Write a protein that binds this ligand. Structure first.
Ligand code: HEM
Ligand SMILES: [Cl-]
Length: 397
């Protein structure tokens, strides 16, 4: 395309690439949209928010899977069939059956559980240098997922590890050898999920697994769709929340004075979480979309079949919308929210829940503990999709 000529080039698949490099900022200043090998990347806030819900764009995940050349198999079947790849009737149908526990009223019903779990987890924290992921960021969303999906709470470590051993990001590749491990992980996770699904087929409960089992008994979805949807919810609910919590500690370790502001006034925790989501969103690229038809935004024309990815990280650093955009500050009253959860019909199902987990965690950690200090080498996730510490050695003073 000729209208693509003057667009800035960025390659976020480069192991040398950084989201906070000067060339990224320069690209955003120059253009609302950048060119990448995989997609057009929307860099500014206004456009990134609006395009995530624009009806001219459908889900881009299937396009991604094919574009990276993921070979045929159970892993590919999951990535092309799961909720995030679906649109229209099929999407509304599946998403609807899993909505109820995430309604911002049922979120309030789970709030006391989230609080006490956080409280318990803080009680069992080590006194010295310890990995925050293993001791908090992993257990918290794992226990929450178990409570939502109806798994025994004692299985929280197993259920978490199941998701860890099935890194879907690694499978967005044509490599056969790395794929074997992802496929092995997927199978093991299904083994656990299917067994729990069969239990709920006999005796349905109040949980989400039982909810979806009820829809199966009413013939709204088939058996394959059932277990995929249970798998979709677990992965989407565990990985992001885990990494985002670890990123929260990372931010506050860099800015220990603002942690103290929350200690003094715990009511600052809601907008503190928002600042964490703004400054370091666990998914730098939020919404992956493909053009369903020909159209034109700001002169740049997008033909049918063009992948368009919303870059939340860069859009959060947009000075057109955010005051002192590159400074981490919890106290500034923001006019616009973070868009760490995407938009449109695909908008994060667990937005309210994720915010509840982050808020309760930050409030209690800041009230009870001294500012976090990095105590060793941080292990970062290098794959496409979820970003953040896989292991975070820290101390609370
Ligand atoms: C802070 C952590 C989280 C972040 C940053 C996050 C972000 C996102 C984003 C950006 C999307 C893509 C939306 C789009 O295409 O516009 C998404 C989808 C989704 N999220 Fe989350 N999420 C988080 C936690 C959770 C939790 C706790 C759950 C609950 C299980 C959850 C469930 C889902 C589901 C089921 C989808 C697919 C929905 C669909 O395709 O319609 N997420 N999330
Ligand atoms: Cl439709």
């Amino acid at each position: 395309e000729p209208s693509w000529a003057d667009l800035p080039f960025l390659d976020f698949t480069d192991p040398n690439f950084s989201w906070d490099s000067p060339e990224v900022a320069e690209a955003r200043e120059k253009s609302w949209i950048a060119r990448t090998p995989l997609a057009l990347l929307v860099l500014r806030y206004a456009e990134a928010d609006q395009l995530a819900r624009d009806k001219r764009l459908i889900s881009g995940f299937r396009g991604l899977v094919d574009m990276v050349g993921t070979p045929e198999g159970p892993v590919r079947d999951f990535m092309v069939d799961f909720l995030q790849s679906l649109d229209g009737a099929d999407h509304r149908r599946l998403r609807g059956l899993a909505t109820h526990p995430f309604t911002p009223r049922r979120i309030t019903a789970v709030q006391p559980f989230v609080r006490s779990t956080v409280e318990q987890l803080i009680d069992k924290l080590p006194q010295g240098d310890f990995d925050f992921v293993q001791h908090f960021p992993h257990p918290l969303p794992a226990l929450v997922m178990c409570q939502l999906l109806g798994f025994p709470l004692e299985d929280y470590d197993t259920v978490g590890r199941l998701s860890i051993e099935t890194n879907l990001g690694l499978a967005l590749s044509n490599d056969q050898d790395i794929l074997v491990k992802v496929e092995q992980g997927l199978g093991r996770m299904f083994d656990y999920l299917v067994a729990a699904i069969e239990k709920r087929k006999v005796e349905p409960g109040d949980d989400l697994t039982s909810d979806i089992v009820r829809a199966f008994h009413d013939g709204v979805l088939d058996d394959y769709e059932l277990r995929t949807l249970v798998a979709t919810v677990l992965v989407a609910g565990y990985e992001t929340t885990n990494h985002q919590l670890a990123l929260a500690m990372y931010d506050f370790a860099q800015h220990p004075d603002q942690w103290m502001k929350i200690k003094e006034n715990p009511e600052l925790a809601p907008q503190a979480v928002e600042e964490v989501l703004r400054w370091s969103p666990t998914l730098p690229v939020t919404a992956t979309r493909v053009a369903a038809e020909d159209f034109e935004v700001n002169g740049v024309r997008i033909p049918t079949g063009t992948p368009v990815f919303m870059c939340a990280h860069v859009a959060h650093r947009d000075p057109r919308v955010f005051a002192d955009a590159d400074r981490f500050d919890i106290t500034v009253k923001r006019e616009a929210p973070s868009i760490a959860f995407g938009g449109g019909p695909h908008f994060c199902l667990g937005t309210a829940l994720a915010r509840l987990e982050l808020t309760e965690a930050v409030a209690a950690l800041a009230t009870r503990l001294d500012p976090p200090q990095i105590a060793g080498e941080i292990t970062w996730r290098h794959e496409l999709g979820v970003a953040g510490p896989d292991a975070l050695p820290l101390r609370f003073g």
